[PDB]
Design a binder for this molecule. Structure first.
Ligand SMILES: [Mg+2]
Ligand SMILES: [Mg+2]
Lengths: 38, 111, 191, 130, 292
RNA sequence: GGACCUGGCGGUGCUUCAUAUCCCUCUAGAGGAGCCUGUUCUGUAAUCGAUAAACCCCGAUCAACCUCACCACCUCUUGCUCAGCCUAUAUACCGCCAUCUUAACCCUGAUGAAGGCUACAAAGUACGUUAGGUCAAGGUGUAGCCCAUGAGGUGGCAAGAAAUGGGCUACAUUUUCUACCCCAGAAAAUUUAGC
C-alpha cells in the first residue's frame, strides 16, 4: 500500500457487504437492525 | 406476518447500534449475524422452535434462542457450553446464550 | 416442570430476581403480559414462547425501587461541586478556558472511534491581558475562529492521534498566538 | 431472604486522593436509537438517577433523521434522538454516573457524551515574555 | 372456545399480576389503576411499533376475551323473555317499546347508530330491512313532541360525529415589555420557514428580516400574497407584523410568511372569521414539495 | 306411444344502460444545417475490426510506425512455474429474463321427476414447455490444445455507394451584454413523449 502510493504521489449493495438479492431476503425478515421498508 | 410489518407488528431479530446514523461497522455486524445464525442452527439442528434474537450491548453478544424440549437436558447443557466457548474465542468478545425451551412450535395462524 | 413464578410472593424483592440486564424469561417474570396483533376473534399472544417479547429491550432490571436502591449505594463515589461556583457567571470568571471533548459508545468488539480525538478549546479574549494592538493582531491572526458577537476564540485541534496530544497542541497554539500577538515586528511599524 | 441474610458486606474501597478533581461545566449525553419507546424509558431511568445523585439534568429531543435508499424496492432507516444535559458536576460524580448509565445502556442505543471541562489559563500566558 | 373456568382463572392471574406489577413499580397496589398498568408496561417493555395493538398489553381479561354465553331459559325450560319464540326477542322488545312511546305521545354533529353496533347492543344478528324499520320508527319519534324520557332514549341510539375540523389552535396572546399585546406563529412553504409576530394594534407596517416588505419583496405577487390574510378579514392597516423568514425562494418565502401571519392573526379575530379563513385555505400548510 | 320435470343451450340476435383501456382535448419537440455513427450492399490475400489497453497538451479528434484480431512469409521449444491458452459447452446445470399449454336440518308437490320468495313479508334457517436469450456487475461442472487453439520476428491490412435508425452542437426579441438579483442603460403534415 505504502510502496504503490509513493510512486503515484509523484504523478450493488457494497454498503452492507451483501449480495443485492440477499439484502432483500435479510431485510424482509426484519433481520437487519433498523432496516424497515417504506 | 408479512415483511411490511417489521416496524408495525413484527420487530427486529438482531439489535445493534452499528446501523444507526454515524455509527460504523454495520457490515461487520451483519456478517457476524449471518455466521452466528448458521452456527446456531447447525449446533442445534431441529431444536430451535423459532428464530434467534441477537442482542449486543457494549461488547456483549446475547443469543436469546428459543428451542424445543425434545433433546435431553444434558445435551442442551453440553451444546450451550461448547457454543459459548467457541463463539467467545471466535469473536474475541463475551458471547452468551439464553435458551428458552418450549413444548412445541407456537403456531400463530395458518397460511 | 412448573414455572417458578408460582413460588414468588406478592411482596418479594424484585431487584434480586433481575439483578442485571437479562432477557425476558416468561418462567421468571410473574406478569400475565400479552403482546401481538390479535387474529379475528382472537387475543394477543401469551408470553410463553413469544419471540416478540423476547425482542424487547426490557427495563425489568431497572425499576424505580431498583434505581433508588442502586444510586443510594453509588453516592459514596461522588464529590461535591464547589459551592463558590453558583452560576455560569462565576464559571466564566474563575475558569476562563473551556475544553470540550467527546466519547462514543457503540456496540461491537472494538471500542475505537476516530472522532474521539477532537478537542475544542474556547476562551473569551476579554479574559486575556491584551492591549489594543495585541487584541487587533490576535483577532486578525485567528480570522474566523474569533466570533465578534461572542468575543470567544475557538481553537479546534484534531491533528494528533490521541486526545491528550490534541489538548497539548491546542494549549501550545493558544500560547504562541498570545506571544506572537504581543510582539511587534520591524515590519509591523507602518500599518 | 426471610432469615438467612448476609451479616456484613464488603463495601468497595473508595480512597480520597490528594490530586484536585476535574470540574465539568456541562455534560451533554446524546442517545440515538431506532425506537422512541426505548429512548423514553432510558430518559426516565437517567433522569431518576440524576435527580437522586444530586446532578442537575435537562432533557430535550433533537430532530429525528431519516435515511431513505432504494435498491422499486425502497427501504428506510429512522434515527431518533434524546439529549440529556447535565450541569455543574465534578469529575467523580460525572464518571460514576456515566459508568452507571452506560453499563445500563439498552440494546440498539448508542451514546455520544460531550464533556466541557473548566480549566485555568496556563501560567505561561499570565504575563508576556520579556 | 374459552370456558367460563378459563376466564375465571385468567381473572385470577390478572389480579395477582396487577399486585405484582404494583410491587415492582413501588406504587400502592390498593389504588393501582389500569392507566398505571398501561404506563408501567410501556416503561418496562418499550415498543415503538406503530400499531398500538401490537405493543405490550396487560388488560383485564374481560376486555380481551370475546367469550360470550347467554342462557335464554332456566332448568324448567320456560324462556325468560315473553318474546323468546320470535327469535329476535331483543329487537322486537325494543320495537314494542318504541311503538308504545309513540302511542303515548300520540295520546298527548351526530349520526344514527350503524347496523353492526346496533347488533352489538342487541347481541342479536339483524337484517338491513328491520334496521331500516327501526331507524324509521326512531325518526318518527323524533318528529313528534318528544319529552325527556323520549330524547334520552333516542340519544341512546345516536353516536357522536367527532370529526369537527374547526380545531385550529388559537395562539395565546402574549405581552411585550412595553405592554403591547401580540401573538407569534410559524409557517412553512417548500424549504422556506417563517415566524411572524402580529401586534393587536398597528398602522399596517410589515418588517421582513428587519426590512420593509416593499423592499424585501419587489415583486407585486408576493405583496399580494402578504395582503391576502389581512384583506380577507377587513383589517388592512390595523396591525403591525415583525416576521423572520429563512430558506426557500421568493414565492416560497412569501407563502410561508402568509401562512404565519394568518395563524398569528387568528388570535385577534372571531371564531367565525377563523372558520372563514380556514375555508379560504389561509390556515393550511401546503404539502406539495419536490418529488424524487 | 300419451302427459310432465330439469335443463343445457361451450348458443344466436337485438334493447337498455355501467361503457373504463383507446381516440379527440392540452404542452413541448422532431421536417432544417454541420458532424460523427449502427445496419445493408459491393471490395481485398488480409479484418469494415476492439482501446477498464494507444495517442493527447483549449474543447475535442484521425490513422497511431502503437497494440490484440486478420493475410503472406518464417522462427522458439521441453519450454514458465508437472507449463500456457480472453477456446467450447447455460445445444452442460443451476441464477435470471422471455415463448406457449394447462355440509346439515325443516317444509311443499296426495311423500313423482322436482321445488322453497313477497318487509304493511305468504317456509325457510343453518406446474410443465423451448436445438429460446443472457457467463457484462452471479455461481458448480464438463470437455478441447499442449514441436500448438502456447510464445515470438519480418512485412502487409488503410476501403466506396446509397436507403434507413439513432446520437452531439447553435438555433434570439418572453432574446442578448453590463449593474443588480426583478422600477436601469445599451445592442440587435406525419410522429414521439408527458402530464
Ligand atoms: Mg440455448
Ligand atoms: Mg481498413
Amino acid at each position: 500500500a505504502d510502496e504503490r502510493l509513493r510512486i503515484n504521489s509523484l504523478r450493488v449493495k457494497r454498503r452492507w457487504r451483501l449480495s443485492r438479492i440477499v439484502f432483500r431476503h435479510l431485510a424482509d425478515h426484519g433481520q437487519l437492525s433498523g432496516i424497515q421498508r417504506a | 406476518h408479512a415483511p411490511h410489518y417489521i416496524a408495525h407488528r413484527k420487530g427486529w431479530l438482531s439489535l445493534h447500534t452499528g446501523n444507526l446514523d454515524g455509527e460504523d461497522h454495520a457490515a461487520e455486524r451483519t456478517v457476524e449475524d449471518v455466521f452466528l445464525r448458521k452456527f446456531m442452527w447447525g449446533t442445534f439442528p431441529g431444536c430451535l422452535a423459532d428464530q434467534l434474537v441477537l442482542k449486543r450491548r457494549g461488547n456483549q453478544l446475547e443469543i436469546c434462542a428459543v428451542v424445543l424440549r425434545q433433546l435431553s437436558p444434558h445435551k442442551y447443557y453440553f451444546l450451550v457450553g461448547y457454543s459459548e466457548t467457541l463463539l467467545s474465542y471466535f469473536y474475541k468478545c463475551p458471547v452468551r446464550l439464553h435458551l428458552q425451551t418450549v413444548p412445541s412450535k407456537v403456531v400463530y395462524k395458518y397460511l | 416442570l412448573p414455572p417458578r413464578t408460582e413460588k414468588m410472593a406478592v411482596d418479594q424483592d424484585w431487584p434480586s430476581v433481575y439483578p442485571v440486564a437479562a432477557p425476558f424469561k416468561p418462567s421468571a417474570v410473574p406478569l400475565p403480559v400479552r403482546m401481538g396483533y390479535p387474529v379475528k376473534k382472537g387475543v394477543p399472544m401469551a408470553k410463553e414462547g413469544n419471540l416478540e417479547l423476547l425482542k424487547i429491550p426490557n427495563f425489568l432490571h431497572l425499576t424505580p425501587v431498583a434505581i433508588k436502591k442502586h444510586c443510594e449505594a453509588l453516592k459514596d463515589f461522588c464529590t461535591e461541586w464547589p459551592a463558590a461556583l453558583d452560576s455560569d457567571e462565576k464559571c466564566e470568571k474563575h475558569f476562563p478556558i473551556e475544553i470540550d471533548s467527546t466519547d462514543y459508545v457503540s456496540s461491537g468488539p472494538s471500542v475505537r472511534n476516530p472522532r474521539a480525538r477532537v478537542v475544542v478549546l474556547r476562551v473569551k479574549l476579554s479574559s486575556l491581558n491584551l492591549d489594543d494592538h495585541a487584541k487587533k493582531k490576535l483577532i486578525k491572526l485567528v480570522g474566523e475562529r474569533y466570533c465578534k458577537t461572542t468575543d470567544v476564540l475557538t481553537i479546534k485541534t484534531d491533528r494528533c492521534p490521541l486526545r491528550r496530544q490534541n489538548y497539548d497542541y491546542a494549549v501550545y497554539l493558544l500560547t504562541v498566538l498570545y506571544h506572537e500577538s504581543w510582539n511587534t515586528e520591524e515590519w509591523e511599524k507602518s500599518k | 431472604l426471610h432469615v438467612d441474610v448476609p451479616k456484613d458486606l464488603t463495601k468497595p474501597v473508595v480512597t480520597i486522593s490528594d490530586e484536585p478533581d476535574i470540574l465539568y461545566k456541562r455534560l451533554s449525553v446524546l442517545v440515538k436509537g431506532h425506537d422512541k419507546a426505548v429512548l423514553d424509558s432510558y430518559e426516565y431511568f437517567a433522569v431518576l438517577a440524576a435527580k437522586e445523585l444530586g446532578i442537575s439534568i435537562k432533557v430535550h429531543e433533537p430532530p429525528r433523521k431519516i435515511e431513505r435508499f432504494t435498491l422499486r424496492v425502497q427501504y428506510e432507516m429512522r434515527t431518533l434522538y434524546r439529549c440529556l444535559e447535565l450541569e455543574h458536576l465534578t469529575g467523580s460524580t460525572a464518571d460514576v454516573y456515566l459508568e452507571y448509565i452506560q453499563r445500563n445502556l439498552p440494546e440498539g442505543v448508542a451514546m455520544e457524551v460531550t464533556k466541557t471541562q473548566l480549566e485555568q489559563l496556563p501560567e505561561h500566558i499570565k504575563e508576556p515574555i520579556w | 372456545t374459552y370456558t367460563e373456568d378459563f376466564i375465571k382463572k385468567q381473572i385470577e392471574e390478572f389480579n395477582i399480576g396487577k399486585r405484582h406489577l404494583a410491587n415492582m413499580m413501588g406504587e400502592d397496589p390498593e389504588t393501582f389503576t389500569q392507566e398505571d398498568i398501561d404506563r408501567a408496561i410501556a416503561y418496562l417493555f418499550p415498543s415503538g411499533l406503530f400499531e398500538k395493538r401490537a405493543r405490550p398489553v396487560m388488560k383485564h381479561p374481560e376486555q380481551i376475551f370475546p367469550r360470550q354465553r347467554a342462557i335464554q331459559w332456566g332448568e324448567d325450560g320456560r324462556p325468560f323473555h315473553y318474546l323468546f319464540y320470535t327469535g329476535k326477542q331483543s329487537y322486537y322488545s325494543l320495537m314494542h317499546d318504541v311503538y308504545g312511546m309513540l302511542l303515548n305521545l300520540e295520546k298527548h354533529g351526530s349520526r344514527w347508530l350503524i347496523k353492526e353496533e346496533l347488533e352489538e347492543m342487541l347481541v342479536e344478528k339483524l337484517s338491513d330491512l328491520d334496521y331500516m324499520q327501526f331507524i324509521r320508527l326512531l325518526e318518527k319519534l323524533l318528529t313528534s313532541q318528544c319529552g325527556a324520557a323520549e330524547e334520552e332514549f333516542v340519544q341512546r341510539f345516536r353516536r357522536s360525529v367527532t370529526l369537527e375540523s374547526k380545531k385550529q389552535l388559537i395562539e395565546p396572546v402574549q405581552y411585550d415589555e412595553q405592554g403591547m399585546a401580540f401573538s407569534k406563529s410559524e409557517g412553512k412553504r417548500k424549504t422556506a420557514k417563517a415566524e411572524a409576530i402580529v401586534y393587536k394594534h398597528g398602522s399596517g407596517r410589515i418588517k421582513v428580516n428587519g426590512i420593509d416588505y416593499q423592499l424585501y419583496f419587489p415583486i407585486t405577487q408576493d405583496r399580494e400574497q402578504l395582503m391576502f390574510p389581512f384583506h380577507f378579514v377587513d383589517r388592512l392597516g390595523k396591525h403591525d407584523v415583525t416576521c423572520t423568514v429563512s430558506g426557500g425562494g421568493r414565492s416560497a418565502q412569501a407563502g410561508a410568511i402568509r401562512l404565519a401571519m394568518a395563524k398569528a392573526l387568528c388570535s385577534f379575530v372571531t371564531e367565525d372569521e377563523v372558520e372563514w379563513m380556514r375555508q379560504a385555505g389561509l390556515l393550511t400548510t401546503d404539502p406539495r414539495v419536490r418529488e424524487r
